[PDB]
């Protein structure tokens, strides 16, 4: 045994499930109509909605 002791720390992850409770109509969500923008490549064009 040496002259010193050892305190050792260690974290441990836990796969868990929360449950979220909220009141009626807490926040207001404001949306618009989704817009398509277009990026042109040759063989595969993309559209970002």
């Amino acid at each position: 045994h040496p002259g010193f002791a050892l305190t050792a720390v260690r974290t441990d992850t836990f796969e868990v499930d929360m449950l979220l409770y909220s009141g009626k109509s807490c926040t207001s969500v404001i949306i618009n109509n989704p817009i398509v923008t277009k990026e042109e490549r040759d063989i595969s064009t993309t559209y970002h909605v």
Partner: protein, 290 residues
């Protein structure tokens, strides 16, 4: 084949319906996505997305700056994206007050890591760097996201804001007081062949000359001290083989009636800059001159 098709007027590529509209209306459905005018359809700015860490995104929230990439020999980052303002430390042309200013803004890990990477190998900067163009947008999370422009103009979407490229004043360089009507802008990197001070000279030249032979001929006569320094280091230290005393490449062209002055602001640290409003990007590779 017949005369009516070649006698018809050309079909309006915008006023004809989109591919989604001619797919919907032939089958008559509805969706929550508004379709009838696609964005970016009348665009010629050839964009390219880019991921950057937080240390290289300072001085980039304001749009318009050179997103010049580099490569390190270490295999985990194959490239990195330096800004032109961040290259000012290795720029010998940058004054000491301006250098002490812009070292007080890039104090994150990535900037100084790139600074250590720049001056380590047996090469110069012209085979170390690679130019891309100008940045116009920024997402600005922790790992940000940049959209450069390789070829075209610098505009916001829906064409309502012509973005402008700024360069710092210690890299601006014009050569005649009578500026031409149309002028081009090139990226000069010269080398002073001093032993310890092999840090290069960075210049953004704005001239009316578009030819290449008559540009390097008037470029030999404006860096003759560094040319003689190249020959001097060639003769006093033989059996070492340097090369590419200067390198130029075509960056783009501007209109010469709107190249003006401004100042960047970033965490209330102003910096006087030369601003190019209606910039275009038409790249050329790193050519050299002795």
């Amino acid at each position: 084949m017949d005369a009516r098709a070649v006698a018809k007027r050309p079909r309006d590529p915008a006023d004809e319906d989109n591919e989604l509209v001619t797919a919907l209306k032939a089958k008559r459905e509805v969706n929550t996505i508004s379709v009838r005018y696609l964005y970016h359809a009348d665009h010629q700015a050839l964009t390219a997305r880019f991921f950057v860490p937080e240390g290289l995104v300072e001085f980039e929230a304001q749009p318009g700056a050179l997103l010049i990439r580099m490569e390190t020999g270490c295999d985990s980052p194959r490239h990195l994206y330096i800004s032109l303002y961040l290259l000012g430390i290795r720029a010998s042309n940058v004054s000491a007050s301006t250098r002490c200013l812009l070292e007080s803004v890039y104090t994150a890990s990535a900037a100084r890591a790139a600074l250590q990477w720049l001056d380590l190998g047996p090469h110069l900067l012209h085979r170390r760097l690679e130019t891309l163009g100008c940045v116009k947008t920024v997402s600005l999370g922790i790992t940000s996201l940049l959209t450069c422009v390789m070829r075209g103009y610098l505009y916001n979407t829906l064409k309502t804001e012509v973005f402008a490229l700024m360069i710092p004043k210690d890299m601006y360089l014009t050569w005649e007081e009578t500026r031409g009507r149309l002028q081009y802008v090139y990226l000069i990197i010269v080398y002073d062949y001093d032993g310890p001070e092999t840090r290069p000279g960075i210049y953004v030249l704005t001239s009316s000359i578009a030819h290449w032979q008559t540009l390097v001929d008037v470029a030999r006569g404006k860096f003759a001290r560094e040319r003689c320094s190249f020959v001097n280091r060639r003769i006093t230290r033989p059996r070492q083989i340097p090369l590419c005393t200067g390198v130029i490449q075509k960056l783009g062209w501007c209109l010469a009636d709107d190249i003006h002055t401004s100042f960047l602001v970033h965490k209330e640290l102003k910096l006087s800059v030369v601003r190019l409003d209606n910039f275009s990007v038409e790249l050329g590779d790193f050519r050299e001159f002795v």
